[PDB]
PDB file of C-alpha atoms in Angstrom:
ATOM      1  CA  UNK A   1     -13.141 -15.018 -99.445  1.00 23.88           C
ATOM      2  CA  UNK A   2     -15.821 -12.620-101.236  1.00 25.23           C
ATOM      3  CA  UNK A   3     -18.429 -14.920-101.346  1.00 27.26           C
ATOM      4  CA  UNK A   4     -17.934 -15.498 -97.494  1.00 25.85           C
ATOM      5  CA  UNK A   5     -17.969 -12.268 -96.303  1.00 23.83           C
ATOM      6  CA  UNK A   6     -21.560 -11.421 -98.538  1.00 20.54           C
ATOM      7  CA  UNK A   7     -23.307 -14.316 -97.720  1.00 20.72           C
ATOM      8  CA  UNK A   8     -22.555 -13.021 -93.805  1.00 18.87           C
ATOM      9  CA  UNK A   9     -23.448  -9.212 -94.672  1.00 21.66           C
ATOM     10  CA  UNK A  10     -26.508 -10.845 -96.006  1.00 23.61           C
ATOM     11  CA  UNK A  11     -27.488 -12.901 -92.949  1.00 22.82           C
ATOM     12  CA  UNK A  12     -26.185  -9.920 -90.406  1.00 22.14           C
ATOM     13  CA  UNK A  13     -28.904  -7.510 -92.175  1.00 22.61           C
ATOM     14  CA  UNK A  14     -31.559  -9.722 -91.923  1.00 21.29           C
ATOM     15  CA  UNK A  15     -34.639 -10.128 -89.340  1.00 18.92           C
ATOM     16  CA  UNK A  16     -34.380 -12.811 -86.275  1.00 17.91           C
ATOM     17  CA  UNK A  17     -36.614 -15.438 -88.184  1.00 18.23           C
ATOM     18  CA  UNK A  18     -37.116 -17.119 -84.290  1.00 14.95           C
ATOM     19  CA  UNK A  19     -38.377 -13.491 -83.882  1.00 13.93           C
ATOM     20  CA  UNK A  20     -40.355 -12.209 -86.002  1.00 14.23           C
ATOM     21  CA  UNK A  21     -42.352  -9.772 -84.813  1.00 14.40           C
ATOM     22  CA  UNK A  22     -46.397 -10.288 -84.867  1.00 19.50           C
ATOM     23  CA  UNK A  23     -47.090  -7.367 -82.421  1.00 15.75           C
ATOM     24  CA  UNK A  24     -49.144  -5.189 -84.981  1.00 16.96           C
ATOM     25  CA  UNK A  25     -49.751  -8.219 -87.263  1.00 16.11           C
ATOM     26  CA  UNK A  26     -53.325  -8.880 -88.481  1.00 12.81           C
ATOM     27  CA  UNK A  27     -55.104 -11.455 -90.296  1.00 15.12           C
ATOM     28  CA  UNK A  28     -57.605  -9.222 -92.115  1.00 12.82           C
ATOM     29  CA  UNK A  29     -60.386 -10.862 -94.448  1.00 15.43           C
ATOM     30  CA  UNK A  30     -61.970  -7.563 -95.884  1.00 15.29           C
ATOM     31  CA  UNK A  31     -60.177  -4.974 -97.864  1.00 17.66           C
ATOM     32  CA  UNK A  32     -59.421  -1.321 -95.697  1.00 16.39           C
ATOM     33  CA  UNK A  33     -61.832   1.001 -97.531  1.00 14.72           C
ATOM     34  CA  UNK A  34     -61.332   4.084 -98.268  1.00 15.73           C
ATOM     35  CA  UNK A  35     -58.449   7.067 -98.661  1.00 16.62           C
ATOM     36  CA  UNK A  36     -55.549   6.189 -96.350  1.00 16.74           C
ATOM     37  CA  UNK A  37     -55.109   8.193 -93.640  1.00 17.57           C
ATOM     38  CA  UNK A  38     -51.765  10.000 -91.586  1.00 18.25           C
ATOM     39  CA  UNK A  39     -51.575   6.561 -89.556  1.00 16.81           C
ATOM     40  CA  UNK A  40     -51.057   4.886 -92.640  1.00 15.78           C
ATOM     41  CA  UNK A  41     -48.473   7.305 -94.299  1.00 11.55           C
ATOM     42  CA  UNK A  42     -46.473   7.327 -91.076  1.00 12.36           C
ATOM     43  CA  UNK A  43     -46.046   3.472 -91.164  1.00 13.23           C
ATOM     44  CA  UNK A  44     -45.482   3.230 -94.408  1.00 11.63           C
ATOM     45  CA  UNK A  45     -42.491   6.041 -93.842  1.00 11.97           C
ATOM     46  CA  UNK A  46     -41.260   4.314 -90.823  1.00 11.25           C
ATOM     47  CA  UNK A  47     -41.223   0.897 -92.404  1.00 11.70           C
ATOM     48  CA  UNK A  48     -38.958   3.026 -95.487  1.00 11.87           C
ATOM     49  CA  UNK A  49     -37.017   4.684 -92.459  1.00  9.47           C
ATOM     50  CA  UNK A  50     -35.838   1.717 -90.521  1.00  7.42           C
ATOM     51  CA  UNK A  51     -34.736  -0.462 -93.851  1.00  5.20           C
ATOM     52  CA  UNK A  52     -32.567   2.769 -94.667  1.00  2.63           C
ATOM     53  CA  UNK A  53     -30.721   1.825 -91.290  1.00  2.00           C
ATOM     54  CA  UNK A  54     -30.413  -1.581 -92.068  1.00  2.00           C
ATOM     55  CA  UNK A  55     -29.486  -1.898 -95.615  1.00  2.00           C
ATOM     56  CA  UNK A  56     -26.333   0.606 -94.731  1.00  2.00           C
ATOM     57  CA  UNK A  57     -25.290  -1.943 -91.638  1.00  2.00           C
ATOM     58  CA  UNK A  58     -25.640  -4.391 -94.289  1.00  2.00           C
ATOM     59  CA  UNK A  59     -23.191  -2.068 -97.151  1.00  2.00           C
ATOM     60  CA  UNK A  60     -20.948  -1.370 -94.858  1.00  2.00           C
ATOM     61  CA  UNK A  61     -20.005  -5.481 -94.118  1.00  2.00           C
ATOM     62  CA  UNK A  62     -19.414  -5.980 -98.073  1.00  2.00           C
ATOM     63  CA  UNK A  63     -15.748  -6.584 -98.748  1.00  2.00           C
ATOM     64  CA  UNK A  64     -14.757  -2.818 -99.623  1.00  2.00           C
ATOM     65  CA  UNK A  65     -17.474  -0.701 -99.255  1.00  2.00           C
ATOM     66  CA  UNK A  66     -16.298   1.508 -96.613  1.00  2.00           C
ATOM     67  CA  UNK A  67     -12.528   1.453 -98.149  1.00  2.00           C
ATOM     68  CA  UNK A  68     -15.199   3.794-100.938  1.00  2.00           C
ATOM     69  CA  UNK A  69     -15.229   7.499-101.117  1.00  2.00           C
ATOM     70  CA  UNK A  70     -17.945   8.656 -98.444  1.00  2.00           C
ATOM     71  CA  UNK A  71     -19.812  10.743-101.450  1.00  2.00           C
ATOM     72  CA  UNK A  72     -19.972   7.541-103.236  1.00  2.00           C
ATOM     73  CA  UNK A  73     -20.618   5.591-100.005  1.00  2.00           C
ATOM     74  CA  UNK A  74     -24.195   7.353 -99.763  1.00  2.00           C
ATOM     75  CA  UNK A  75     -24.667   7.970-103.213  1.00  2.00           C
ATOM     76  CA  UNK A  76     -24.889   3.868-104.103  1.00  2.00           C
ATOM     77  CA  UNK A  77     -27.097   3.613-101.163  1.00  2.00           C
ATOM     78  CA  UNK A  78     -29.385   6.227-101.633  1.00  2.00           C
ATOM     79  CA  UNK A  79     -29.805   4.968-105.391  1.00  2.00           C
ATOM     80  CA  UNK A  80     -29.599   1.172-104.544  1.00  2.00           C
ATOM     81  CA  UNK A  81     -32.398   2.021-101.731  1.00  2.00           C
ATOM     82  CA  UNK A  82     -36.119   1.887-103.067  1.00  2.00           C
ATOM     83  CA  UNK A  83     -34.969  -1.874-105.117  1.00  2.00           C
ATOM     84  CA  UNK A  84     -32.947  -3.035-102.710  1.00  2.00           C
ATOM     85  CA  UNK A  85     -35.891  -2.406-100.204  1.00  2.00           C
ATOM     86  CA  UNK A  86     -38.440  -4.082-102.688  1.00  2.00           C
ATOM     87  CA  UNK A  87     -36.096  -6.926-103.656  1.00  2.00           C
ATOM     88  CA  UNK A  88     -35.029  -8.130 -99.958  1.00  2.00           C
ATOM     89  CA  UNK A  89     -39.051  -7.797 -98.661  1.00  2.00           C
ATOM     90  CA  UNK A  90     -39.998  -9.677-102.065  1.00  2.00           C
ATOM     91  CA  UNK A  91     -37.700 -12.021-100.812  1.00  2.00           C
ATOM     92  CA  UNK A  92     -38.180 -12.518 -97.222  1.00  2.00           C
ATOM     93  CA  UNK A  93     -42.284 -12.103 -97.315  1.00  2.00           C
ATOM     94  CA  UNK A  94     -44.687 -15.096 -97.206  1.00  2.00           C
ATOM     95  CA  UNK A  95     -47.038 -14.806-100.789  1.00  2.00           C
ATOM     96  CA  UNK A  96     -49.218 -17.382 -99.867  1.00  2.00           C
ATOM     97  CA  UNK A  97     -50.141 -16.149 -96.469  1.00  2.00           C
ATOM     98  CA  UNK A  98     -50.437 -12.765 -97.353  1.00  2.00           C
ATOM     99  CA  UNK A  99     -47.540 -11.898 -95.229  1.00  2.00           C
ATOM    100  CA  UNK A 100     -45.052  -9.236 -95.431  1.00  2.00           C
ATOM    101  CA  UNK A 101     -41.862  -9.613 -93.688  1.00  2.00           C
ATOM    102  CA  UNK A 102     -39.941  -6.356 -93.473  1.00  2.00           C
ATOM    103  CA  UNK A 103     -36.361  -5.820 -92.135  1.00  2.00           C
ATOM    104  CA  UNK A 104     -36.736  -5.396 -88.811  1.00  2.00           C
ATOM    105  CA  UNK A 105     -38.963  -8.694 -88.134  1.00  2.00           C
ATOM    106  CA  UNK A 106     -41.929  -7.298 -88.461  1.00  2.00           C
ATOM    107  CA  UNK A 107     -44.699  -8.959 -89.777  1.00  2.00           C
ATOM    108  CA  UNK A 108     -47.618  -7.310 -92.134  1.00  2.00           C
ATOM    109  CA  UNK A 109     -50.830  -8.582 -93.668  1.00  2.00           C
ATOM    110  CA  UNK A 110     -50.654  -7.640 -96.914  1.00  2.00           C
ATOM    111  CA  UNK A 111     -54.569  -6.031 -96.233  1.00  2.00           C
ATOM    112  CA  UNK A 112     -52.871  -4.185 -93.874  1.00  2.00           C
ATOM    113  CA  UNK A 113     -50.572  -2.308 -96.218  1.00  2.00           C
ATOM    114  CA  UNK A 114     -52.339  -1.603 -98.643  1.00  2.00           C
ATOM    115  CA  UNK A 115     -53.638   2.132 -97.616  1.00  2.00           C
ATOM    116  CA  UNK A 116     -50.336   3.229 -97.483  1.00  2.00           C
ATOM    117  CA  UNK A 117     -48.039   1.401-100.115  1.00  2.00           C
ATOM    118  CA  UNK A 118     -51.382   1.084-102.537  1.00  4.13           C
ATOM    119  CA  UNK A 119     -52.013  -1.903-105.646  1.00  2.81           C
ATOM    120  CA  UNK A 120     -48.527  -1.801-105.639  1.00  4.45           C
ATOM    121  CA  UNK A 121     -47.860  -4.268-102.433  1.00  3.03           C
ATOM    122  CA  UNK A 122     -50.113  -6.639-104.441  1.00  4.68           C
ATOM    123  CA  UNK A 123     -47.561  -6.358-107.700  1.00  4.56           C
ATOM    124  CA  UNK A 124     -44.344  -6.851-104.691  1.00  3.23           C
ATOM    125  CA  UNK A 125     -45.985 -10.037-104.194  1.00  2.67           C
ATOM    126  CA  UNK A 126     -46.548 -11.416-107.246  1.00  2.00           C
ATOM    127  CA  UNK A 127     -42.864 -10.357-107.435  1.00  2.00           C
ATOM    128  CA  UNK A 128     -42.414 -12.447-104.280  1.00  2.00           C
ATOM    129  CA  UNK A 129     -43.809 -15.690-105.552  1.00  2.00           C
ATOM    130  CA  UNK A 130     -41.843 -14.993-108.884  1.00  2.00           C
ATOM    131  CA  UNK A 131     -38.683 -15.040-106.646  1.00  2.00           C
ATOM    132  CA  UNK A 132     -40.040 -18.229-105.009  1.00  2.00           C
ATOM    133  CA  UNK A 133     -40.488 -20.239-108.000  1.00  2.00           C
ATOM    134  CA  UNK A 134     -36.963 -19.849-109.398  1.00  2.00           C
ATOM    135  CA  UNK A 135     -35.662 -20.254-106.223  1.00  2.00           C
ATOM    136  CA  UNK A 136     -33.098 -18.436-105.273  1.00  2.00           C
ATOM    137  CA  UNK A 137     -30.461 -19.393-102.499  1.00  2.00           C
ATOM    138  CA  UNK A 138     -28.607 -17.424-100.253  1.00  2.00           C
ATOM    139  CA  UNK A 139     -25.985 -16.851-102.087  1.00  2.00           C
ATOM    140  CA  UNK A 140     -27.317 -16.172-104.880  1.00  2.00           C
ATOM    141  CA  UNK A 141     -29.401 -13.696-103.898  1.00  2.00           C
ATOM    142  CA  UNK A 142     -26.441 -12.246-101.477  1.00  2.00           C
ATOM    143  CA  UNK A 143     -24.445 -11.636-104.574  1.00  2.00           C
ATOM    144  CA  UNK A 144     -27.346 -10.324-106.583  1.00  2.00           C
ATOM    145  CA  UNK A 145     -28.569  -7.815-103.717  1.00  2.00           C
ATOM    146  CA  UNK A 146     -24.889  -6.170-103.731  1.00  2.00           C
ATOM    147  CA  UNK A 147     -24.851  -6.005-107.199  1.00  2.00           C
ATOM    148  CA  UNK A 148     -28.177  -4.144-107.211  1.00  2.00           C
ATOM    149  CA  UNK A 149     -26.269  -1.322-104.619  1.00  2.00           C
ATOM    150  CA  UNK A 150     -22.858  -1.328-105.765  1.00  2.00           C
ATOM    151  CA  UNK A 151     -23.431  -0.339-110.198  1.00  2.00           C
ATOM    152  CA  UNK A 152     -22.463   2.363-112.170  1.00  2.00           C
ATOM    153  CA  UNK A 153     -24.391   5.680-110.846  1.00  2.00           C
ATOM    154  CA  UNK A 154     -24.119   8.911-112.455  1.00  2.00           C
ATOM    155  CA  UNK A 155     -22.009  11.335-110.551  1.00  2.00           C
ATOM    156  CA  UNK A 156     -19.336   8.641-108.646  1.00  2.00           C
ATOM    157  CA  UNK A 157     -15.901   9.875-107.815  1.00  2.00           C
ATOM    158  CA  UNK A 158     -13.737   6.983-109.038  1.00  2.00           C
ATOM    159  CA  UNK A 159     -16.535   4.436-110.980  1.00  2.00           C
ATOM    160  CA  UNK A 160     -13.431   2.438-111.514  1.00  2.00           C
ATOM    161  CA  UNK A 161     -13.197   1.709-107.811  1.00  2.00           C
ATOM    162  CA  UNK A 162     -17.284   0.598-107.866  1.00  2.00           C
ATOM    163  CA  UNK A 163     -17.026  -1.001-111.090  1.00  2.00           C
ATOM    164  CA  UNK A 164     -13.914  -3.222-110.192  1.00  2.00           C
ATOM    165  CA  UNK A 165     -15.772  -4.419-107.231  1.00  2.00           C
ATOM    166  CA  UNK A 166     -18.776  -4.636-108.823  1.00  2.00           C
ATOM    167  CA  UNK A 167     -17.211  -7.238-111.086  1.00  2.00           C
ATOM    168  CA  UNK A 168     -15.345  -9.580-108.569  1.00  2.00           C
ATOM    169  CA  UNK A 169     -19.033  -9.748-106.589  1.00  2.00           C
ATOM    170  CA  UNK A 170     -20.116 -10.509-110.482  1.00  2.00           C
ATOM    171  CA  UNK A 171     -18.006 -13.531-110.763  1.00  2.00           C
ATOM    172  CA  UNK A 172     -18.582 -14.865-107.599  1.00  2.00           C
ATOM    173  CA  UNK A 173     -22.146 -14.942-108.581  1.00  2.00           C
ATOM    174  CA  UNK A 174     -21.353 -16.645-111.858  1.00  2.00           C
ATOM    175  CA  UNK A 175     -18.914 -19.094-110.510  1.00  2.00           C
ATOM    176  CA  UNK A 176     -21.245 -19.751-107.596  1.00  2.00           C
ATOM    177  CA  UNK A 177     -24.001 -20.394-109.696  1.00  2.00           C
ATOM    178  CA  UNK A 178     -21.929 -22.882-112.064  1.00  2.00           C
ATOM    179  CA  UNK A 179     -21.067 -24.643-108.997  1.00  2.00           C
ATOM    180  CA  UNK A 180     -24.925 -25.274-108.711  1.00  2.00           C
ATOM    181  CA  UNK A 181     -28.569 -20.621-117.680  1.00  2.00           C
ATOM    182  CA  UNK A 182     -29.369 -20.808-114.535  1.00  2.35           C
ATOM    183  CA  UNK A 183     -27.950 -17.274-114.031  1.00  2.00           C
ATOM    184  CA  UNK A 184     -29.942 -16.041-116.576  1.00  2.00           C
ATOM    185  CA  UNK A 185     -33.004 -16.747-115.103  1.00  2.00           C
ATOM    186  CA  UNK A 186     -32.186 -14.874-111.763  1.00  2.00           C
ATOM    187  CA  UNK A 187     -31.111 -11.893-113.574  1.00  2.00           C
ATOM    188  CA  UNK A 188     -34.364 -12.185-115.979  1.00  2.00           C
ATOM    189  CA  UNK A 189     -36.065 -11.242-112.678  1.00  2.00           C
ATOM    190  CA  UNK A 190     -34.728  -7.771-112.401  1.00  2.00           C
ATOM    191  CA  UNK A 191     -36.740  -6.384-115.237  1.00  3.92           C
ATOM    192  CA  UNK A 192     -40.049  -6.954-113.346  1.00  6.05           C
ATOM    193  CA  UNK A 193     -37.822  -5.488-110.161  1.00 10.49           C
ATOM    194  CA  UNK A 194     -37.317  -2.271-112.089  1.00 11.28           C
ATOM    195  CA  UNK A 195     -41.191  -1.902-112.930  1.00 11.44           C
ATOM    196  CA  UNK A 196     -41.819  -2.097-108.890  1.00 14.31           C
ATOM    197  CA  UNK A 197     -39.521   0.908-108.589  1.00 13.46           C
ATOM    198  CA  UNK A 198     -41.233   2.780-111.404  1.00 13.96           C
ATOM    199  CA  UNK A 199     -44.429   2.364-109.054  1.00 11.61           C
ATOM    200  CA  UNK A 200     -43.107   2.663-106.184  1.00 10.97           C
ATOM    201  CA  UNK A 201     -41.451   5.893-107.060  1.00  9.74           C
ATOM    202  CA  UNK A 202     -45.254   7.273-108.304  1.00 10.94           C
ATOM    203  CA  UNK A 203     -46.883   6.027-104.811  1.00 13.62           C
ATOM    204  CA  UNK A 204     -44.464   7.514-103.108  1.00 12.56           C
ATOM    205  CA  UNK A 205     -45.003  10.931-105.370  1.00 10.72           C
ATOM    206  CA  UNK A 206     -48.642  10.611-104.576  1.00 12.13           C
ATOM    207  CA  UNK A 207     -47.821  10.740-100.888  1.00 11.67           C
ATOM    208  CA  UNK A 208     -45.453  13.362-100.876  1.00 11.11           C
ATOM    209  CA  UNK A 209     -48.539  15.961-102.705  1.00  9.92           C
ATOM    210  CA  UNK A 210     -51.254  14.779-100.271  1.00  9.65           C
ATOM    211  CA  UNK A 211     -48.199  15.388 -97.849  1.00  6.22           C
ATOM    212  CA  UNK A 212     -50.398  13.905 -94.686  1.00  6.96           C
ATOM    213  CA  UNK A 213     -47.520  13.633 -92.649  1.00  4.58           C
ATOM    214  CA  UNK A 214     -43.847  14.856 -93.403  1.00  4.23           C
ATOM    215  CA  UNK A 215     -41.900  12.652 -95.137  1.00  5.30           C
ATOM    216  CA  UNK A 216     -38.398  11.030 -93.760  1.00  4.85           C
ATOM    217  CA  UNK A 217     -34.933  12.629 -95.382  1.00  7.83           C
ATOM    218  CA  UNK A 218     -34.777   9.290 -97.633  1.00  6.45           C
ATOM    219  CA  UNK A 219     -38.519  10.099 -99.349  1.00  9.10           C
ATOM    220  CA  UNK A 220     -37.168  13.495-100.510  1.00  9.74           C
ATOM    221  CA  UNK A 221     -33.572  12.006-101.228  1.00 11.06           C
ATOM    222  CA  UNK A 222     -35.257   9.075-103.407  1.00 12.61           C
ATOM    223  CA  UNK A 223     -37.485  11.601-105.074  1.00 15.78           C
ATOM    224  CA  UNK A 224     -34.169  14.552-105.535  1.00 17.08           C
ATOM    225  CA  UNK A 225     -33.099  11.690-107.597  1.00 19.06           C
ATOM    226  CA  UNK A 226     -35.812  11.583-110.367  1.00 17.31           C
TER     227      UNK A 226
END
């Protein structure tokens, strides 16, 4: 069944929780001072880089994404990227501790990000605890991620093919979600989701003109885009 298969994808794409991965993590107690430097940038890229890897492992396993078109197979991704990146580390990261879990394990202080990702981080956890309070299982939240990458995007060979699974992974979600508005609630999170992008999208222009280091393919894709 649908359901099935994206509450796997879900679990599949995620980090080893038994590992985690704590071999740059820091407990910082004062801010990082000052203008971030090409260390920074480059971590912040990689971290971008290696989720790009991941989320596609994790498209691929939903229920008909690879019976897509291969232009449209790239095209959801590339456009689902930057909130589905956001929404699965708002997610998986620890508010309270000041921890941010990204999708390969590894674990951040939030101090520690905040050079290269900027105020923002501190608005992706507020985000986070928003998330938390709801609460929002797994399959909940392994129907809404797939709905966030596979939705109408300008310039899709046959929408009718995205939009007709888009809707089964839809009803799931609301059938799911009777079985435990409730719905509405989840889905009133995605407004605040969309101002993370907005920002997102503007740290990541400020990085591309102090251009430190060269960006990865996905900065310029995400930023083609706009």
């Amino acid at each position: 069944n649908l359901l099935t298969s994206l509450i796997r994808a879900h679990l599949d794409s995620g980090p080893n929780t038994a590992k985690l991965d704590y071999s740059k993590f820091q407990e910082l107690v004062l801010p990082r001072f000052g203008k971030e430097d090409a260390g920074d940038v480059q971590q912040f890229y990689d971290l971008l880089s290696g989720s790009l890897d991941v989320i596609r492992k994790w498209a691929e396993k939903i229920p008909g994404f690879i019976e897509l078109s291969p232009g449209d197979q790239d095209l959801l991704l590339e456009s689902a990227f930057l909130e589905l990146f956001i929404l699965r580390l708002a997610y998986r990261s620890k508010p309270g501790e000041g921890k941010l879990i990204f999708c390969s394990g590894l674990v951040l202080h939030r101090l520690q990000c905040a050079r290269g990702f900027g105020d923002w981080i501190d608005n992706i956890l507020a985000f986070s605890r928003s998330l938390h309070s709801l609460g929002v299982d797994v399959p909940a939240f392994a129907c809404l991620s797939a709905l966030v990458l596979i939705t109408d995007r300008h310039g899709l060979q046959d929408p009718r093919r995205v939009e007709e699974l888009q809707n089964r992974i839809a009803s799931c979600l609301k059938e799911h979600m009777a079985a435990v508005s409730c719905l509405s609630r989840l889905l009133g999170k995605l407004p605040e989701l969309r101002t993370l992008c907005t920002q997102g999208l503007q740290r990541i222009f400020c990085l591309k003109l102090e251009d430190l280091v060269p960006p990865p393919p996905i900065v310029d894709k995400i930023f083609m885009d706009t």
